[PDB]
Amino acid sequence: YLSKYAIDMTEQARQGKLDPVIGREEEIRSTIRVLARRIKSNPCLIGEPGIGKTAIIEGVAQRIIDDDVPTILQGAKLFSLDLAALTAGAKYKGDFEERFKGVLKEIEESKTLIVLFIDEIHMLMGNGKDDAANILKPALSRGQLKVIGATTNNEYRSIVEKDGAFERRFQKIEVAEPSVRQTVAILRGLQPKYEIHHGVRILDSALVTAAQLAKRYLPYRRLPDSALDLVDISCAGVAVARDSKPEELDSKERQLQLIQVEIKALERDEDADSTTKDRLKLARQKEASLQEELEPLRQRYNEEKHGHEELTQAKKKLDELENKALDAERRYDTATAADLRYFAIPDIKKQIEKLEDQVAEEERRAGANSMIQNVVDSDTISETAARLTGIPVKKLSESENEKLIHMERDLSSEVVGQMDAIKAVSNAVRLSRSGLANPRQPASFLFLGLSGSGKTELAKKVAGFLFNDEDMMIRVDCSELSEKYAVSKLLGTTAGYVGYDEGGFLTNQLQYKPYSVLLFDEVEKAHPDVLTVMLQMLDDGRITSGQGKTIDCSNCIVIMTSNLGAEFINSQQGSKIQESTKNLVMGAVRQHFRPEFLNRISSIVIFNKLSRKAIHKIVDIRLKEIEERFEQNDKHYKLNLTQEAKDFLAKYGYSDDMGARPLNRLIQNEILNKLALRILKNEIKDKETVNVVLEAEECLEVLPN
Amino acid sequence: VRILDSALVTAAQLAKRYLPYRRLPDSALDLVDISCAGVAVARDSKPEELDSKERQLQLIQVEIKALERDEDADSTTKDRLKLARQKEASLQEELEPLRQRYNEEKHGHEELTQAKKKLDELENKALDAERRYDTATAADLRYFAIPDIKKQIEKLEDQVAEEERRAGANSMIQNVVDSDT
Ligand SMILES: Nc1ncnc2c1ncn2[C@@H]1O[C@H](COP(=O)(O)OP(=O)(O)O)[C@@H](O)[C@H]1O
Ligand SMILES: Nc1ncnc2c1ncn2[C@@H]1O[C@H](COP(=O)(O)OP(=O)(O)O)[C@@H](O)[C@H]1O
Numbered sequence: 105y106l107s108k109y110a111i112d113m114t115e116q117a118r119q120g121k122l123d124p125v126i127g128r129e130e131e132i133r134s135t136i137r138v139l140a141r142r143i144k145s146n147p148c149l150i151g152e153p154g155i156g157k158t159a160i161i162e163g164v165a166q167r168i169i170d171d172d173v174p175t176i177l178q179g180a181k182l183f184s185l186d187l188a189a190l191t192a193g194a195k196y197k198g199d200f201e202e203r204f205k206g207v208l209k210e211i212e213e214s215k216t217l218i219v220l221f222i223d224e225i226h227m228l229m230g231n232g233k234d235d236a237a238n239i240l241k242p243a244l245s246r247g248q249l250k251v252i253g254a255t256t257n258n259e260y261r262s263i264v265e266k267d268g269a270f271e272r273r274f275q276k277i278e279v280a281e282p283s284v285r286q287t288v289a290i291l292r293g294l295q296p297k298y299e300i301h302h303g304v305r306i307l308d309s310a311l312v313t314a315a316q317l318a319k320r321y322l323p324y325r326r327l328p329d330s331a332l333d334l335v336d337i338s339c340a341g342v343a344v345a346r347d348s349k350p351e352e353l354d355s356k357e358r359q360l361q362l363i364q365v366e367i368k369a370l371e372r373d374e375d376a377d378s379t380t381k382d383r384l385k386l387a388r389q390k391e392a393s394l395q396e397e398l399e400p401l402r403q404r405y406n407e408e409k410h411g412h413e414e415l416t417q418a419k420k421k422l423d424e425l426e427n428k429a430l431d432a433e434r435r436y437d438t439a440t441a442a443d444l445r446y447f448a449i450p451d452i453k454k455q456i457e458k459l460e461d462q463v464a465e466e467e468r469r470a471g472a473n474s475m476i477q478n479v480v481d482s483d484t485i486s487e488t489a490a491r492l493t494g495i496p497v498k499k500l501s502e503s504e505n506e507k508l509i510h511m512e513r514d515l516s517s518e519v520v521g522q523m524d525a526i527k528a529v530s531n532a533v534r535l536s537r538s539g540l541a542n543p544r545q546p547a548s549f550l551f552l553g554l555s556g557s558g559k560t561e562l563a564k565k566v567a568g569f570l571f572n573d574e575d576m577m578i579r580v581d582c583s584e585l586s587e588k589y590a591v592s593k594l595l596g597t598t599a600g601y602v603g604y605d606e607g608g609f610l611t612n613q614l615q616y617k618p619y620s621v622l623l624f625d626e627v628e629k630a631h632p633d634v635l636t637v638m639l640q641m642l643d644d645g646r647i648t649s650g651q652g653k654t655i656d657c658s659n660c661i662v663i664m665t666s667n668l669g670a671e672f673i674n675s676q677q678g679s680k681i682q683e684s685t686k687n688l689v690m691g692a693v694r695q696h697f698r699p700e701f702l703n704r705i706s707s708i709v710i711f712n713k714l715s716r717k718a719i720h721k722i723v724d725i726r727l728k729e730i731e732e733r734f735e736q737n738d739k740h741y742k743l744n745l746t747q748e749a750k751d752f753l754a755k756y757g758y759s760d761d762m763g764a765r766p767l768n769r770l771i772q773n774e775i776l777n778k779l780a781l782r783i784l785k786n787e788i789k790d791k792e793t794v795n796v797v798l799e800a801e802e803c804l805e806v807l808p809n
Numbered sequence: 810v811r812i813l814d815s816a817l818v819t820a821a822q823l824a825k826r827y828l829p830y831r832r833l834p835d836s837a838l839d840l841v842d843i844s845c846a847g848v849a850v851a852r853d854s855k856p857e858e859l860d861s862k863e864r865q866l867q868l869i870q871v872e873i874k875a876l877e878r879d880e881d882a883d884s885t886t887k888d889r890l891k892l893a894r895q896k897e898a899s900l901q902e903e904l905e906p907l908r909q910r911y912n913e914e915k916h917g918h919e920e921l922t923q924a925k926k927k928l929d930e931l932e933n934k935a936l937d938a939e940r941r942y943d944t945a946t947a948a949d950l951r952y953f954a955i956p957d958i959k960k961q962i963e964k965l966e967d968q969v970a971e972e973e974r975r976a977g978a979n980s981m982i983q984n985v986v987d988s989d990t
Contacts, residue, residue, distance in 0.1 A: 133850055140846040144839065174849050433871050442874035450880055 106207040109189035110220070114182045117165040120427045125163035126293035127286045128156050131279055132163040138275045139164075139177050139219065139250055146245070148225055149254035151279040154329035156290075157254045160279065161221055170434055180217035180250075187227055190236065204237045212247050225253030225274075226263055238267065245273050258653040262599070265652075281327050287315040290328050291335060296423050302339035303416040304346070305463075305478035311335070313481040320502070320571070321489040323618050337492075338485045346409060346477050353402055360394040367391055408473035411462035418459050422452035498572040508534050511569060518565040519558050520725065521679065521718040525551070525709045529566060532706040533661070545643040545704070548662035550627070552669045552689055553711030556763020560623065563663045567621045570661075576620035578613050578660075582627050585634040590650055595637060598650040611647075611655045618659055627664035628696050635701060643704040668692045669710065676760070679715045686710055714763055716754055723753045723767055730771065741792045748796040749774075749805045756800040774805045782809035810848045811918070811977040816987035817841070823988075844990055852983040859907035859980075866900040869893050911980035917965045918981050924965065928958040 116122060125132070131149070138147035149157040165182045167173045173180075189207065190200040211218050222228060229238040241251070253274060255263065264271050282290065291311040299306055311331075318330040325333070370376065370384045425448035432440035464472040471478075479485060482500055490496035507514075511530045516523055532547035534540070541547065551559035568574035591597045594614075596606025614622065624630070630638070641647045645657040669689030677685060689710055693702060702708070714722065724745065731741045745753070757770035782788045788809075797806035817837075824837040831839060853860035876882060876890035931950045938946035970978035 137843070137846040137850045140849045141842045142845075143842050172853060174853065176849065438870065438874045441871055442878040445871070445875045446878050449875070 105193075106183075106189065106203075106210050109186050109193055110207070111184035111186075112181055113162060113184055113221075114165045114168055114180070117162060117169045118431075120431065122162055122166075123159065123297060124293050125156065125159040125166060126290040127282050128160045128163055128279075131156075131160045131277065132167060134277050135160060135164050135252065136167065136173055136177055138277065139180075139252070140174055141275070144273070144275050145250055146274045147252045148260065148274050148276045149252070149279050150257050150260045150276040152256060152281060152326050154326035155279065155281050156328060157279060158223060161223070161252060161254075177217065177219070180219050181215060182219045182221065183211075185220050185222050187224070200234070200236055201240065204240050208240060208244055208249065212244060212249055218249070220249065220251040222251065222253045224255065226255045226259045228253075229263070229267060233267075238270065242269055242273065258651075261652050284315045284319060284327070287318075287328050287331050288312050291315065291331055294332060295335075296419060298335055298339050300416060300420045300423060302336075302343045303413055303477075304339045304342045305412065305415070306335070306339070307479060307481055310338070310479045310481040310485050314338070314485050317486060317489045320619055321493050321499070324616050334485055334488060335479070338479050338488045341488055342477060342479055342484060346412075346475060349405055349475065353398075353405070356394060356398055356401060360391065360398060363387055363391045363394065405475050408463070408475050408477065411459060411473065412477045415456065415459035415463065418452060418455040422448060422456070425452065495572050502572075504537060507569065508537055515562070515565055515569060517725075518568070519562045520722045521714055522553075522558060522562070522711045525562060525711050528707050528709050529562075533566075533570070535706075536659075536661075541706075543658060545645060545706075546657075546659055546661050547706040548642060548664075548704070550664045550666060550693070550702075550705050550708040551711065552666055552693075552709065553673055554667065554670055554713070554761065554763055556759065556761075556765035556767075557711045557714060558764070559665045559711055560625075561764075563621055563623050563665075566661070570621075571619050576617050578610060578617060578620055578622045580610065580622065580624045580627075582624050583629040585630040587631050587633055589631060589634045589637070593634075594641070594647070594655070595650040599652055604651060606651055607649050611649050611653070614647075614655060614657060614660060618657060621661040621663055623662070624664040626667060628666050628668045635697065639701050639704065642701070664705070666693070668696055673710070673713060676713060679712045679717060681710045681712055713760075716758070719754050719758050719764060719767060720750065722764055723750055723757070723771060726764075726768060727771055727775070730775075738790075740790065742794045743792075744794045745805075746794070746796050748798070748803070752796075752801055752803060752805060770801070774801070775807075778805065778807040778809070782807075785809050810845050810852070810985060811975075811982040812841075812845070812985050813976045813982070813987050816844075816985065816990070819988045820844070844985075848983050848985045848990060855908045855911045856980040856983045858984070859904050859911070862900045862904050862907075866897050866904060869897045869900070873897060907980055914969050914977060914979040914981040917969045921962060921965050921969075924958045924961045928955065928962070931955050931958065 135147050135149070139145050149160055151157070161182065164173070164177075168178060168180055168182065171178060185207070190203045194200050194203050207220070211220065228236055228241075230236045233239075241249070257278075260276060288311050291314060292308070295306050295311060298304070314331040314334040315327065317334060318325065318327050322330045322333070367384065367387045370381055370387065375381050376384075425444060429441050429445035429448060432438075432444060466472050476483075486500050487496065490499050493499065508530070511533070512523065512526045515526045515530070519526060529547070529549060532541075532549070536547040551563065553559050564574040564577050567576045585593065589595065591603060591606060592609055594607045594610035596611060597603035610622070614620070624638070627635075641657075642662055645660065647655040647657050649655055669692050672685045672688040672692075673681070675682075675685050690708070693708065727743050727745060731739070731743055753767050753770060757767040758764060759766050794807045797803065820840040821833060821837040824831065824840050825833055828836045828839065848857075851857050851860075854863050873890040873893045876887040876893070879887050881887050882890075931954050935947040935950035935955070938944070938950065969981070972978045975982045975984065
C-alpha cells in the first residue's frame with residue numbers, strides 16, 4: 105500500500121497543480137543525466153533548502169510529462185517518498201522494514217520505469233541507521249529502482265562518511281543558491297501565483313527589491329524562498345489592509361460622531377446667539393462633508409477593491425487558460441490549443457488591460473485607486489523587511505553608493521580624527537563594493553594603536569554605518585586562541601569527538617551575520633597555529649568548520665586589532681603618525697606575522713593619537729550621543745559641559761594610555777550621578793539646565809539640582 | 810549511444826589525468842557512463858540536431874494553430890502562419906530522416922545488442938556441453954545456432970554502416986566525439 109503515502113509527482117504534474125520551475129534547467133538536465141547513467145544512476149540534490157530542489161525534481165517530472173526526456177527516463181513515473189510511509193504507516197519497530205519492502209516489491213515489479221525520491225536523504229538511516237530503508241535499498245539497488253535523494257551539503261558529507269555504501273550508488277549533484285537576478289526571474293515566474301493568491305498587484309521593482317532585501321535582511325535564509333517569503337508576507341500585509349481598512353473608515357465615522365456632538369453643544373448654549381463662536385456654520389460644513397463622504401469611503405475603497413478583484417480574476421483566468429491550453433498542447437490537442445490558447449490571447453489581454461484601466465490614473469498620478477492594492481517595492485516590501493529587521497528609514501534608504509560617497513564624512517562624525525584610517529577603510533570597502541576587488545576576499549584591516557584610540561570603536565561604527573547596526577560585530581578573544589584551539593572557536597570541536605554543536609560563537613554567529621565585521625581583539629596574542637587557521641579563513645572566505653560543515657563567508661569585513669606597535673605610538677611624537685614611528689610598527693608586525701598573513705590584509709592602518717585636539721570634540725559628541733541613545737522624549741538635555749567640564753574630562757578623564765576609555769566612564773559616572781540626584785529631588789520635571797562648580801576631578805563637575 | 814573508439818582511449822587518459830582519486834577501471838567508466846549519459850541527454854528527442862529542430866517545429870506548430878484560429882486569423886498579421894507552416898514542414902522533412910535514421914539504426918543497434926548476448930549464451934551452453942564431452946548438445950548450439958546470430962550481426966552492422974567521421978553512418982552516435990564530448 106505504498107500508494108497511501110507515495111506521491112506520484114509525475115501524475116500531479118500531468119494535472120499541473122505545481123509551481124513552475126525557473127532557473128534550474130541545467131540541474132534538471134544533470135539529474136536526468138544521472139538517471140540516464142547505466143550504473144551510477146541515483147542522483148542527489150546536494151545543497152541548501154529553500155532553493156528549488158523540489159522544483160528540480162518536479163522539473164524533471166515536467167520534462168517527463170512533456171516528452172522532453174530520453175526514452176530511458178521518458179516513460180518514468182516519479183514518486184515522492186516520506187517518513188510517513190515507514191513511520192506513521194508503521195508504528196512498530198519492524199514495520200518500517202515492511203513498509204519499505206512493500207515499496208520495493210510494488211515498485212520493482214511494475215510499470216517498467218519508476219523513479220522514487222527522498223528530499224531528506226539524511227532521514228533514511230536516521231540516528232542508529234536501523235535499516236531505515238538504507239540497507240534494503242542497496243539490497244535491490246542493482247534492480248533498477250532508480251532514486252534521487254537530497255540534503256544540505258554539510259549533512260551530505262556527513263552521510264557519506266557515516267554510511268559509505270550509498271556513495272557507490274548515489275551521485276551527488278551540487279546545487280546552489282541562485283543569483284539575485286536569477287532570483288528575480290524566479291520571482292517573476294512565481295509572481296502570478298501570489299498575484300492570484302492574494303489578489304494584490306506586484307510591482308516588478310518590488311520583486312527586485314525582495315531579492316535585494318533578502319541579501320542583507322534575511323541573510324541566513326536562502327534567497328529564493330526568502331525573497332518569496334518577503335513577497336508572500338508583503339502581499340499578505342497589503343491584503344490584510346485591503347480587506348479591512350478600519351483606520352480610515354472607522355476613524356472618519358467616529359469623527360462624524362464627534363463633530364455632531366460639538367455642533368449640538370454650540371447650537372444650544374449661552375454663546376449660541378453670540379458673536380463668540382459664530383463659526384458654528386463651519387462645523388456644520390464638516391458634519392455635512394462627513395455625512396456624504398463616509399459611505400463613499402467604504403464604497404469607493406470597495407470599488408477600488410472590486411477593480412482589483414476583477415483584475416486578479418482576469419490574471420487568474422489567464423493562468424488557468426494557459427494551464428489548460430498548454431496541457432492541451434502537451435497532449436497534442438492542437439485543436440483545443442488553437443481555440444483555447446487563442447481565446448486566451450485577446451480575452452485576457454483586453455480583459456486585463458481594461459481592468460488595469462479601472463485602476464486608472466489621476467492627473468497627478470498613475471493609479472487612481474488610493475488604497476494601492478499592490479506590493480510597492482520599498483513602501484511595502486522594504487517596509488516589511490524593516491518590520492522584520494528594524495531601523496526602517498536607514499534600511500529603506502539604502503543605496504550602496506550614497507553610503508560610500510559620504511562614508512568617511514559620516515564616519516568622521518562618529519570617530520574623531522584618524523580620518524586616514526577612515527578613508528583607508530572606506531576605500532577598501534569601496535573596492536569590495538562594486539566588485540572591483542576579487543570577491544574571494546572582503547576588505548580587511550589591521551588596526552594599530554592604543555586602547556581608547558577608537559580602533560574597535562571605529563570598526564563598530566563602520567559596521568554601524570555599513571549594516572545600519574553596530575552590534576553586527578563578531579568579536580574574537582584572540583588571547584584565548586591557544587594551541588588547544590577548536591571547541592569554542594570557529595573551527596569547533598572536530599566531528600567524531602564530543603560536540604557537534606560547535607563554534608557557535610563564530611561559525612553560527614557569522615552564519616547569522618554574514619553582513620558584518622569579524623574582529624580580532626589583540627590578534628598578535630593569537631597562537632601561531634591559529635593564526636594560520638584564521639589566515640586561510642582571512643582570505644578565501646569559504647570557511648569550513650572542524651565538523652566538515654561549510655560556513656561560507658565572503659562579504660564579512662575582517663578587522664584585526666593590535667597593540668603590537670604600541671611602543672612606537674607611545675613616542676607621542678604629535679598626533680599624526682610619523683615616519684620611522686610607523687616603520688617600527690611595520691617592523692614589529694612583520695616579525696610577528698608571516699608576510700603571507702600580512703599580504704592578505706587589505707590594509708594595515710595606524711591610528712593617530714587622538715590627543716587633546718580630538719577629545720575636544722569627542723567628549724562633546726559622546727555626551728550628545730549618550731543623551732540621544734539614552735532616551736527619547738521624556739528627558740531633554742542642554743548638555744552644556746561648559747568649557748570647564750570639557751576640560752575636566754580632557755584633563756582627568758582622557759588618558760594617554762587608556763585614551764577615551766576613561767572619558768566615557770567618567771562622563772557617564774558624573775553625569776549620571778548628578779542626574780540621578782536631581783531626579784531624586786523630584787523638583788525636576790522636564791527640559792534642562794547644566795553647570796559646573798569648582799583629587800583628580802576634585803571639582804566633580806557639579807551640575808544644579 | 811554509439812561511441813567513437815578513440816573516445817575510450819581518451820577517456821582513460823582523461824580520467825587518470827583529471828579525476829584525481831578515482832580509480833581507472835571505474836573512473837574511466839565514470840567518464841564513459843557520464844558522458845554517455847551526457848549524450849543521451851543531449852540528444853533528447855532521438856539524436857542531437859533533431860531535438861532542437863523538433864523544438865522549433867513544436868513552438869511553430871503551436872504558434873500556427875493559435876494564429877489559425879483568431880480574431881484576425883485572415884489578416885497577413887496572423888496568416889503568416891502559412892510560412893511558419895512551411896518551416897514546420899521543412900523541419901519535419903529533416904526531422905523525420907533524423908528520427909528514421911536514428912530509429913532504424915537503433916533497431917539494428919538493439920538487434921546487435923541482443924544478437925551478441927544470444928551469441929554468448931549459445932557459446933556458454935555449447936562450452937558446458939563440450940567440457941562434458943556432450944558433442945550433441947554443443948552441436949545443437951553450434952549448427953545453425955551461432956551461424957544465425959553471427960550472420961545477424963554481420964548483416965546488422967553493415968546496415969548500420971560506419972564512416973570515418975563516426976561510429977554509426979546513420980544517426981545512433983548522436984555525433985558523440987571522443988575528446989570533445
Ligand atoms: N525557480 C523555482 N521554481 C520553483 N520553486 C523554487 C524555485 N526556486 C526556489 N524554489 C523553492 O524551493 C522550494 C522547494 O525546493 P527546496 O526548498 O529546495 O526543497 P525543500 O522543500 O526540501 O526545501 C519551494 O518552496 C520553491 O518555492
Ligand atoms: N569618537 C571617537 N573617536 C575615537 N575613539 C573613540 C571615539 N569614541 C570612543 N572612542 C573610544 O575607542 C574605544 C573603543 O575602541 P578601542 O579603543 O579600540 O577599545 P578597546 O581597546 O577596549 O578595544 C572606546 O573606549 C571609545 O571610548
